[PDB]
Ligand binder design. Structure first.
Ligand SMILES: NC(=O)c1ccc[n+]([C@@H]2O[C@H](COP(=O)([O-])OP(=O)(O)OC[C@H]3O[C@@H](n4cnc5c(N)ncnc54)[C@H](OP(=O)(O)O)[C@@H]3O)[C@@H](O)[C@H]2O)c1
Ligand SMILES: NC(=O)c1ccc[n+]([C@@H]2O[C@H](COP(=O)([O-])OP(=O)(O)OC[C@H]3O[C@@H](n4cnc5c(N)ncnc54)[C@H](OP(=O)(O)O)[C@@H]3O)[C@@H](O)[C@H]2O)c1
Ligand SMILES: C[C@]12CC[C@@H]3c4ccc(O)cc4CC[C@H]3[C@@H]1CC[C@@H]2O
Ligand SMILES: C[C@]12CC[C@@H]3c4ccc(O)cc4CC[C@H]3[C@@H]1CC[C@@H]2O
Lengths: 285, 285
């Protein structure tokens, strides 16, 4: 159908549920290109798509690895319509542990995927939206890009980076009639975390005993935050559709109002210490 | 002298003036290791140091390239005292132009220096401060890390990343008695900008005519913002000393109160659109 939507990172979580929520839409107005780093993992996407009854042709899958600009351009070339009306930059990776225990590859990967990957997506797809004078870009955001979290130093570094990247682009884009919005998400049940790490044996080798202990405490605490605040990817998908529907989309959309008070205490105390003291008390006690 | 201070990026600007402001301090309590990417450029540092009368031994220069962990560890090994009381992460690069005109090397460099470089500094020097139960880390910040600026997409991406990185570390660090603060700076007369770019011929080749035109407009506008708001590096150095003096340093220190209203409109309108509309009007008219 008429609105062409291209989504990154659709093998699971937000991306997967958003592709099927769009392709199974009552109005049948979306033509979805669900992109995945590795096409062989598309099984779960179709199982969900078939549970929602997506009309043949409403959903097509492509291989798109955000670390490779040749993969990104190849995917763009497979959009048969020759246009993308809604570009959703969703692919992302986590990175957890003491800063000193993180290796150079892991740090570099996180920045390459979460930041440079988005830049690649935007360089390949913004030109044509500017030429056409229209387009929507939706970026999966995180409360981790709005407030720092202990033992997520590089991950927060990467999520804050998208905030800077998208805000800077948004200031330029108004006059071109291209809208950019971030969908700010808290914890989401998606297996994002399941790969965020483990291996206490190796970690203890890379840091001191006190840091290690504080790490275990952070891990106990995020086990409760996840049970307390994870949302399901279906709920998050609805926030994207809210954004793609608005005639004049705002820069930010929040999927929960839950972390706002905490967010407000970084501003109402500009020195930023109130936040630091409050987050240390919530995490470590 | 007694407080050992190690500073990155001292061939010019903030780093240069901060090293000499500390080594020429009346109390003569600072022993400064002024680090530079390339030792052969140390001329300007000494000229200023000799204009301020720094006692022999108050200032030592080392080579330290933040993109190389071997250079970073080698520099740490030359601290004869075996300790660093104040670590100042100042090295940084700019990147300007239409997002689509930026090459992969340039983007990668900016992130490698501004973000990963700080991570390298922190991995090499935090362990010993945690072991000792004391230390101050001061990071040169930017209003560009707090609000997005058109045509500085990757630069803002990198400066926001430091915000995330330092806030996340700050939450962990309290209990270790190690303080981390960011020194938020606006435009500074330092030649940072002088290398931020030019070459309209090559740029026009990489983007569309409308974007190009908007770029020229941004360039006219930053010529006035720089004359209107640049501060001198001596003024910025005093803010670092304010931070290193406080018995309980806050996470953020601002060198000007000038951009706060703008900063406040990103929060008081959480959708973040008020800011986007206001920044577009200030830059493009
Ligand atoms: N999960 C949370 O609690 C949470 C909270 C806030 C924000 N977010 C954000 O939500 C987004 C979606 O993640 P999720 O929570 O749904 O986790 P997820 O279930 O692990 O899904 C992330 C997707 O990104 C893909 N991806 C990873 N590397 C890629 C690459 N190089 N090229 C293309 N795609 C790649 C993954 O594919 P593969 O499976 O093949 O690797 C997967 O399809 C991320 O940007 C993110 O960080 C998540
Ligand atoms: N200038 C502004 O208007 C402004 C505004 C806000 C924030 N800041 C920030 O202020 C900091 C200091 O910059 P500045 O304004 O003083 O500009 P600058 O005069 O160009 O000084 C930056 C210094 O960083 C060094 N550097 C660059 N790459 C390095 C590397 N790979 N390893 C070690 N050192 C390296 C440069 O050395 P080389 O000369 O050899 O390259 C130079 O000594 C930066 O983090 C920054 O982005 C500046
Ligand atoms: C930033 C994340 C969402 C917000 C989460 C949060 C939010 C508030 C809080 O007090 C603790 C945590 C712990 C884990 C955080 C997450 C780590 C991954 C995710 O992106
Ligand atoms: C972010 C910077 C400081 C703040 C500057 C600013 C701040 C406010 C504003 O309205 C325009 C500009 C243009 C250039 C910006 C700068 C680019 C380099 C510097 O780091």
């Amino acid at each position: 159908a008429r609105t062409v939507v291209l989504i990154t990172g659709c093998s699971s979580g937000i991306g997967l549920h958003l592709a099927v929520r769009l392709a199974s839409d009552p109005s049948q107005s979306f033509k979805v290109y669900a992109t995945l780093r590795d096409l062989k993992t598309q099984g779960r996407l179709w199982e969900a798509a078939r549970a929602l009854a997506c009309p043949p042709g409403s959903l097509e899958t492509l291989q798109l690895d955000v670390r490779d600009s040749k993969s990104v351009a190849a995917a763009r070339e497979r959009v048969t319509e020759g246009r993308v009306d809604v570009l959703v930059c969703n692919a992302g990776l986590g990175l957890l542990g003491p800063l000193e225990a993180l290796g150079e590859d892991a740090v570099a990967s996180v920045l390459d995927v979460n930041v440079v990957g988005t830049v690649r997506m935007l360089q390949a797809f913004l030109p044509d939206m500017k030429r056409r004078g229209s387009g929507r870009v939706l970026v999966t955001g995180s409360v981790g890009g709005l407030m720092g979290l202990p033992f997520n130093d590089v991950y927060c570094a990467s999520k804050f980076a998208l905030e800077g990247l998208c805000e800077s682009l948004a200031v330029l884009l108004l006059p071109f009639g291209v809208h950019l919005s971030l969908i700010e998400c808290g914890p989401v049940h998606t297996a994002f975390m399941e790969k965020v790490l483990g291996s206490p044996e190796e970690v203890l080798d890379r840091t001191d005993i006190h840091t290690f202990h504080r790490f275990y405490q952070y891990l106990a605490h995020s086990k409760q935050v996840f049970r307390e605040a994870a949302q399901n990817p279906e709920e998050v998908a609805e926030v994207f559709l809210t954004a793609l529907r608005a005639p004049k989309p705002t820069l930010r959309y929040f999927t929960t109002e839950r972390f706002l008070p905490l967010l407000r205490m970084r501003l109402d105390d500009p020195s930023g210490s109130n936040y630091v003291t409050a987050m240390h008390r919530e995490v470590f006690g």
